[PDB]
Amino acid sequence: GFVGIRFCQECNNMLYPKEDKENRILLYACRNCDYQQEADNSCIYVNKITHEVDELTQIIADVSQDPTLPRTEDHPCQKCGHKEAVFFQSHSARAEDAMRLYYVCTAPHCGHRWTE
Amino acid sequence: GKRIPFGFKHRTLPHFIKDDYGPESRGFVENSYLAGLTPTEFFFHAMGGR
Amino acid sequence: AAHVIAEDVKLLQFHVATMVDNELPGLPRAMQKSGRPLKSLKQRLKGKEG
Amino acid sequence: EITPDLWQEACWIVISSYFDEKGLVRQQLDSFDEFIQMSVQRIVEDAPPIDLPPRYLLKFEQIYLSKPTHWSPMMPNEARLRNLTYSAPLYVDITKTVIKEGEEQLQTQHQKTFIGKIPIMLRSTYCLLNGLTDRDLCELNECPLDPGGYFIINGSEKVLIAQEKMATNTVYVFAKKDSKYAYTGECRSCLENSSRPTSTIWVSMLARIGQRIVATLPYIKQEVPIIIVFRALGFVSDRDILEHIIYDFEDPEMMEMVKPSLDEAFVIQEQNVALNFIGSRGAKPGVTKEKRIKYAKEVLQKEMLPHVGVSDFCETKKAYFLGYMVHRLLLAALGRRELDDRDHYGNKRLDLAGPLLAFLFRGMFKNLLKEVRIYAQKFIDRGKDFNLELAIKTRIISDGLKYSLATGNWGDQKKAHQARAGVSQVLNRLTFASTLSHLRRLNSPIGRDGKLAKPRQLHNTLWGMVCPAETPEGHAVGLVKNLALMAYISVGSQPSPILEFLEEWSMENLEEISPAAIADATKIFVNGCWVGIHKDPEQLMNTLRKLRRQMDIIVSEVSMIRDIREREIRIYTDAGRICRPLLIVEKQKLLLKKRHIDQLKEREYNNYSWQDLVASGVVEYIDTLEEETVMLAMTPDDLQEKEVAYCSTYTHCEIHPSMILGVCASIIPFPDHNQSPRNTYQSAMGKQAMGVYITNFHVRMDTLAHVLYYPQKPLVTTRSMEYLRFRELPAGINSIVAIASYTGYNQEDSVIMNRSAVDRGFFRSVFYRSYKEQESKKGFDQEEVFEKPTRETCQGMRHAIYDKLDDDGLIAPGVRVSGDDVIIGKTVTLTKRDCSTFLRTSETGIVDQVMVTLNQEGYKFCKIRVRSVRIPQIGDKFASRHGQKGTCGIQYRQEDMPFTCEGITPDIIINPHAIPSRMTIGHLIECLQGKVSANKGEIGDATPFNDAVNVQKISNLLSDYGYHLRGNEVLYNGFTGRKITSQIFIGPTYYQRLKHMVDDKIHSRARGPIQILNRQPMEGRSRDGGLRFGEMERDCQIAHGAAQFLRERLFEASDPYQVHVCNLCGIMAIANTRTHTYECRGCRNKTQISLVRMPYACKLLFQELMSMSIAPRMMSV
Amino acid sequence: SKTYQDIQNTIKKAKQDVIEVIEKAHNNELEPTPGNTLRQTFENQVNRI
Amino acid sequence: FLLGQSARDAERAKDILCRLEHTTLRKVTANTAIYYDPNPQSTVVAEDQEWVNVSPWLLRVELDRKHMTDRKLTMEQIAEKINAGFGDDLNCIFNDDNAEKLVLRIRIMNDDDVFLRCIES
Amino acid sequence: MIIPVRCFTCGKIVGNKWEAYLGLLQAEYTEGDALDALGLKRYCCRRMLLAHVDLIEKLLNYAPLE
Ligand SMILES: [Zn+2]
Ligand SMILES: [Zn+2]
Ligand SMILES: [Zn+2]
Ligand SMILES: [Zn+2]
């Protein structure tokens, strides 16, 4: 998982994590406000050293209407079942391994994306 | 020392499709000087000879 | 006037140094007031074409 | 119906119609016309009214410009011959309103006050030649083929080279290695034509809790952390900030990435301490806190992100824009978006003769306002009602432009060394392809002696914009560049109609956005101002495109880029965007159908034009940043036909692929059959080929002109060199070349010429050198006058024969003259000193014409030009269109040259070894098809990529005329008549004769003139100098151990000299050798003196040391 | 012409082989050469072919 | 050049390479996070490791296998070098080499909340 | 500029054929049949007329007087 920034409710500033040294529980207090809200995630911070990220989260469906981009008829969609699909390599710079191809259904109101 | 670089976004020239790593898409001139170069490979030849 | 004598000697120091090195760090480069910087004796022999 | 192939004809009816509508220098003419029609008025209009004891307001209106006039209309040829500046007076309407005590103001309007002469570019909308017919141009002694696009400054044709620059208003993210910054989001900002120069911003991230984002605001010495900057824009909350920087908080990764910049700033919350922070980093921080705030408030209002807006737009619109700069930095750091390539040509702009001059006019204007301000101050403030008509120092504009267009120092003469240099170069009249290419020349300002290769490399994005072949092989290689034939530089248009249109179509304006909308919404960027977002970018792109295809709301030069991956629509209308037309593709058919071709074939007869192809949505100007997003077929029949599909989604099609070539490269036949450096070498040498450089050359007094006697049209041409007008002003002769070794005098890159062909006028040329001299009132007692000197009175007087010139003091046309002959007899009174002008040493020509006139000063001024027939000789440099180059190595009469069965001897025999290492097979195919063309009896096509032509097809044709199909022939040795056992490849090839003749290069010295400072030979042939025996030669003679020849070269044959030195010290003594008495002052010794054979430059060095208080005491001990 | 036919056949095979190496990389079937990234492996394969 | 029999077999030349190629935790680490698991046995991430080992917060560092194995490394030497490098302020309850996840749990005992990020960084 | 008097390569007088050449082209002889009809056999003579650009007709547009 991760942890987001949860903003103060009074000042809308950033809440820092702080241990309740009395009840022994994680809080989220503010710097400017005196706003103590009770944590739930028990996490301060994460850091994916692997830099493993799923590209399908970053691939946006609008890419299908890109004329610049190669179209296959060799991998059909799964939700609808369209034949047409654009495909491309991960445009993200973290790709020295990923010449893997990401496919997008070329059919409006679907935008189903998958990797084979 | 490398093949023709993607100076357009993920492609060498607008005539090629994005992520076309194929031979002619990256500067492989397949004709001879007697056959004459295709215009794309003429431009890649110019890039190389520069 | 001990006040002004300080400035007089400061300006003499500027001219004499610029006679043998126009390119002081920070100090204004001596010039022929129409633009062109003054070729100091250093510059007469400093580098190539010395 | 569609073009059913047979498409080559159609393809060159297009293009032909383009070059009918837009002659080759259109990018200069339009830039200037736009400067004069808008930018000049814009600058004077947008300069503020001037005001100050009572105070006036002084204000300017409706700037007017007449036709060019001498005070009566000057023709450009007159300005050229009389060394005038071809220019037109600029007038403006000035309203003066002084107001004072008692409420008594008079708004007296000074109508059409003369501000100054502005220099006019030739054949502009404001040149006398505009739209003028060929008959009239010939009557003006102008050339109807001359392109225009250059200025006349004091008689010199001055071209403004288009200067490349980074695009303004556009964010760029770079990694600068060898710095503390992992990434840097640069921006360079200009709101509109501002007298303030472009202001540059950087939002860098320190690489090193790590990952802190800084900002390098202008006029700030330190680097404020960005969150302080957003708080200075008044956003207290960490959620009002970040709403500008992270458009969906749903991304944890940017959130946790930006956190440490907030931890750099959380000590500051209110806007006022933020401004105190920024003000305390000011380059001129005020003592009191309030002045620091006001300073920093101004910087944010007016200096940061000015393009986004000023004043009220500060606290929102450009808060969003700074947020976007940060957002794209974060994308570049997460690697979600690639770094911008600084050399991608969509990221560049070209400052043509418009912006180049608008910059100066904003610099020379405003100066005039300062001048009139100081004047009216001095007067009015002393209760002395000034006259503004005396206040206006018209010299400021007229001489400012004249100066900068002359020197090219693009700045004040007070500060020229700080300015750009060579922006304005003397037009290359050497040959018409040189004139045409000098006018179409681009220039990167990147430093030469900059070792970087990447700015010199041919970037992929120069396709169709810039010639891949035409670059100087020198130190400027890849920095100076050339426009491609159809490349058009966009002149600039107002975005306001586009912004009004985008206010329709359900666009959502940036200040009315709820920021949560930005997460899933395309961001719109007009001229790099972010101006709104849109829910539906598939409608905008189709509508904005439709409107371009209808020429109505959006002018053709506007480029709309749709970045799909990142939801951004960027629309550029500004000037300097290089673009080129492309055929539009829809479905898979072209829109260019047989209707358009038929209509355009009868053009003029129906007054159809290229503009109708544009305004019929058939062809479209695409520009390198929109070229990012086209899918571009290369010909229809190749790429859109139902092969097993490559893409089948082409949006555009190349009009013809040879249009990637520029002016000098598109004269190469079969350039696709040559090694690329050889096409570059031709693009070079093609600017030196003698031809006829312009048809009015008999009126030009150009300093250097070479005119070929019998220049010919090439027997094989590209089609492109139709529009270059090469068949009208050709530069070269089709010669029967033979590629044979023969006698070996053609061996290492040399040619054997036919002496008998030369006797018939083969490549014979004429060389015109013009000498200009005028008069002057040097002083009270000193005055120059054109007058035959006479030994009786003229005291100074050369050893020359002064009687060749008649009593006018001017040599007359038709007189034979040689080096150090007197050309313009001139005396200056002391009785009279001789000041005359002599023909350059070893020039030896005939006076062609003598013109006499008055210059601006109203002094008699004459220009004499002397012609010199240059019969080709051994050492003259010939070249061909394929980068084969070589000196004539010997000339054999027709009897001695080899001959075919018929008595066809070659004209030029070039050694086979020129070919195999260089692979200029375009040269061989030219020769073969030229031999076909000459037999077939019509001019072959050598347009590069024409698959209708191939070697086998030519060989088939050649075999039909009874020649060997490969162009070989049996030759017979001219000396013995025996058949040569190897059959020789012989045929017509277009050769050029280059300006590099040997008699202009041969040079010798044996004790000629000496420099005055160090008594060494003068430098250069013209000076009759001595060759430099340099350092490396010194080393080569040390290696030889040739110390005697090293001593003679570095001393006895350069600056042989002697000093007397004291024996007791080594300071040079005083030596009256005339009485043989010697002393050293300082020891008072007269016997202790010894002579030292000593290089004069060494003596001078030691005296330059003594003048530094260094005693190089030379000792004989 | 027989030489040209051999040359063209050789290039066609080489183009097809490069297409097959691309297919192998696109499917992630191309195992990297030791030390090389997968991209460096692909580029080395294509340059060799 | 390799002196011993290692000169022949690529296997016993490999460990020389591992003993030479500079290998910091970043090379074998995968995912580094923090947690205010109020007791060692609280095990908010659901782990049975501390319970056999029987601060209110810890560093958790799930390391990599195909990177730790390729170096012939073990949690043993990693934890040793950690404790030696930073001293006994840090305690490391490493996993075992049987589990699927290669976690290290790191705590301090005797400005602290940021301090685990400070020492990890 | 003007037509060369002799074919540079061989020597045949081509300086009396240019106006004839153009007149034959005005009879709409094809461009090589004009040369075949003037009597230019060698491709060295033919490239004298094919290649020649008659610039003197443009130079004569400029007036010395009238
Ligand atoms: Zn709070
Ligand atoms: Zn689908
Ligand atoms: Zn002495
Ligand atoms: Zn002939």
For residue G22, the CA-to-ligand 4 centroid distance in Å is 19
CB-based contact A71 D648, cutoff 8 Å: yes
Is D588:D640 a contact under the CB 8 Å cutoff?
yes
Of D729, D657, D669, nearest to D990 (Cα)?
D669
C-alpha span between B8 and F57 (Å, rounded) = 50
Whether residue D1062 is annotated as binding a ligand: the answer is yes
Sheet holding F58-63, edge to edge: A43-48, F29-35, F58-63, F102-108, F90-94
Within D994-1069, strands assigned E span 1058-1062
Q: Give the structural domain span for G12.
A: 1-66
For residue G15, the CA-to-ligand 4 centroid distance in Å is 12
Instruction: List the 908-927 stretch of D: residues with Cβ below 8 A of B.
Output: 919, 921-922, 925
Sequence-distant (≥ 6) Cβ neighbours of residue D504 within 8 angstroms: none
Could you tell me if A87 and A116 lie in one domain? yes
Residue of A nearest to B10 (CA): A91
Is G43:G32 a contact under the CB 8 Å cutoff?
no
> Angle, nearest 10°, between helix axes D353-364 and D395-407?
140
Sequence-distant (≥ 6) Cβ neighbours of residue G25 within 8 angstroms: G31, G34
In the DSSP assignment, the letter for residue D943 is: -
Rounded-to-10 torsion of CA D910, D912, D917, D918: 40
C-alpha span between D228 and D231 (Å, rounded) = 5
Tokens of F85: 């490098």
Could you tell me if A86 and A110 lie in one domain? yes
- Helix, strand or coil, per DSSP, at residue D438: helix
Whether residue F36 is annotated as binding a ligand: the answer is yes
C-alpha span between D271 and D288 (Å, rounded) = 17
For residue D907, the CA-to-ligand 4 centroid distance in Å is 11
Within D695-804, strands assigned E span 704-708, 716-717, 733-739, 750-754, 765-774, 784-786
| Ligand nearest, relative to CA of residue A64 | 2
Residue of E nearest to B2 (CA): E43
Is D930:D940 a contact under the CB 8 Å cutoff?
yes
* Chain A residues inside the 8 Å CB shell of D210: none
C-alpha span between D429 and D434 (Å, rounded) = 7
Could you tell me if A60 and A40 lie in one domain? no
φ/ψ of residue D804, rounded to 5: -70, -30
Nearest to E19 among B2, B3, B22 (CB): B22
Inform me whether the C-beta atom of residue D2 falls under 8 Å from chain G C-beta atoms: no
Is D708:D690 a contact under the CB 8 Å cutoff?
yes
C-alpha span between D160 and D1092 (Å, rounded) = 56
| Ligand nearest, relative to CA of residue G48 | 4
Is D97:D44 a contact under the CB 8 Å cutoff?
no
HEC profile of D113-132: EEEEEEECCCCCCCCCCCCC
* Chain B residues inside the 8 Å CB shell of D458: 43, 46-47, 50
φ/ψ of residue D480, rounded to 5: -75, 135
Beta carbons within 10 angstroms of residue F26's beta carbon? 8
| Ligand nearest, relative to CA of residue A110 | 2
C-alpha span between C30 and C14 (Å, rounded) = 9
Residue of E nearest to B29 (CA): E11
* Chain B residues inside the 8 Å CB shell of A68: 11, 14, 17-18
For residue A11, the CA-to-ligand 1 centroid distance in Å is 5
Count of alpha carbons within 13 angstroms of residue D186, beta-carbon side: 17
Sequence-distant (≥ 6) Cβ neighbours of residue D46 within 8 angstroms: D193
% helix / strand / coil in chain F, to the nearest 5?
40, 20, 40
Of D561, D558, D577, D538, nearest to D498 (Cα)?
D558
* Residue B18 CA: distances (Å) to CA of A88, B38, D347, D779, D1082: 7, 20, 20, 74, 85
CB-based contact B39 D658, cutoff 8 Å: yes
Residue where the block lists tokens 């500033």: A13
Could you tell me if A42 and A67 lie in one domain? no
Count of alpha carbons within 13 angstroms of residue B40, beta-carbon side: 21
C-alpha span between D598 and D806 (Å, rounded) = 65
Number of domains in chain G: 1
Tell me the CATH number of domain F6-121, given options 3.10.129.10, 3.40.50.720, 3.30.499.10, 3.30.1360.140: 3.30.1360.140
Could you tell me the CATH number of the domain that includes residue G20?
A: 1.10.10.60
For residue D921, the CA-to-ligand 4 centroid distance in Å is 26
C-alpha span between D533 and G66 (Å, rounded) = 68
* Burial of A57: CB neighbours in 10 Å, binned 0-12, 13-18, 19+: exposed
Tokens of D445: 């300002």
φ/ψ of residue D274, rounded to 5: -60, -45
User: With breaks defined as C to next N over 2.5 Å, after which residues does chain A break?
Assistant: none
Beta carbons within 10 angstroms of residue D158's beta carbon? 24
Could you tell me if A99 and A55 lie in one domain? yes
Could you tell me if A66 and A105 lie in one domain? yes
Q: What are D477's strand-pairing partners?
A: D480
Q: Determine whether D33 is an active site residue.
A: no
Could you tell me if A71 and A100 lie in one domain? yes
Is D996:D875 a contact under the CB 8 Å cutoff?
no
CB-based contact A99 E37, cutoff 8 Å: no
φ/ψ of residue D457, rounded to 5: -70, 150
CB-based contact B19 A70, cutoff 8 Å: yes
Nearest to A47 among F32, F35, F57 (CB): F32
For residue D1095, the CA-to-ligand 3 centroid distance in Å is 21
Is D1085:D1062 a contact under the CB 8 Å cutoff?
yes
Q: Taking CA D343 as the corner, what is the angle to CA D337 and CA D347, rounded to the nearest 5 degrees? A: 70
For residue A76, the CA-to-ligand 2 centroid distance in Å is 7
Number of domains in chain A: 2
Query: Within its chain, how far is the Cα of D3 from the centroid?
Result: 40
Tokens of D830: 């002391």
* Chain E residues inside the 8 Å CB shell of A100: 26, 28
Is D694:D700 a contact under the CB 8 Å cutoff?
yes
C-alpha span between D176 and D162 (Å, rounded) = 28
Amino acid identity, residue D523?
A: K
Tokens of D949: 């032509």
C-alpha span between B4 and B11 (Å, rounded) = 9
Q: Which residues surround ligand 3, an ion (CB under 5 A)?
A: D 1062, 1064-1065, 1080, 1083
Q: Give the structural domain span for A19.
A: 3-47
φ/ψ of residue D612, rounded to 5: -75, -30
Of D723, D1113, D561, D670, nearest to D927 (Cα)?
D670
All structural domains of chain F with their residue ranges: 6-121
C-alpha span between D1108 and C18 (Å, rounded) = 11
| Cα Rg, chain F, nearest whole Å | 17
Inform me whether the C-beta atom of residue D675 falls under 8 Å from chain B C-beta atoms: yes
Beta carbons within 10 angstroms of residue D450's beta carbon? 12
Of D710, D722, D729, D720, nearest to D429 (Cα)?
D729
Instruction: List the 116-175 stretch of D: residues with Cβ below 8 A of G.
Output: 134-135, 138-139, 141
Tokens of D147: 């392109």
C-alpha span between D963 and D986 (Å, rounded) = 11
Sequence-distant (≥ 6) Cβ neighbours of residue C9 within 8 angstroms: none
In the DSSP assignment, the letter for residue D1048 is: I
Could you tell me if A37 and A59 lie in one domain? no
* Chain C residues inside the 8 Å CB shell of D1101: 45
Whether residue D1065 is annotated as binding a ligand: the answer is yes
C-alpha span between F80 and F73 (Å, rounded) = 12
Residue of D nearest to G37 (CA): D937
% helix / strand / coil in chain C, to the nearest 5?
50, 5, 50
Distance from CA of D780 to the nearest CA of C (A): 25
Resolution (angstroms) stands at 3.0
Could you tell me if A14 and A66 lie in one domain? no
Distance from CA of B2 to the nearest CA of E (A): 9
Could you tell me the CATH number of the domain that includes residue A58?
A: 2.20.25.10
* Method for structure elucidation: cryo-EM
Inform me whether the C-beta atom of residue F114 falls under 8 Å from chain D C-beta atoms: yes
Whether residue D467 is annotated as binding a ligand: the answer is no
Residue where the block lists tokens 């303004």: D168
Of F94, F102, F98, nearest to F49 (Cα)?
F94
Query: Within its chain, how far is the Cα of D757 from the centroid?
Result: 39
| Ligand nearest, relative to CA of residue D1064 | 3
Could you tell me if A37 and A53 lie in one domain? no
Could you tell me if A53 and A102 lie in one domain? yes
Is D856:D778 a contact under the CB 8 Å cutoff?
no
φ/ψ of residue D973, rounded to 5: -65, 130
Distance from CA of F32 to the nearest CA of D (A): 14
φ/ψ of residue D474, rounded to 5: -70, -155
Of F35, D138, D902, nearest to A41 (Cα)?
F35
Sheet holding D109-119, edge to edge: D50-51, D55-65, D87-99, D109-119
C-alpha span between D274 and D277 (Å, rounded) = 5
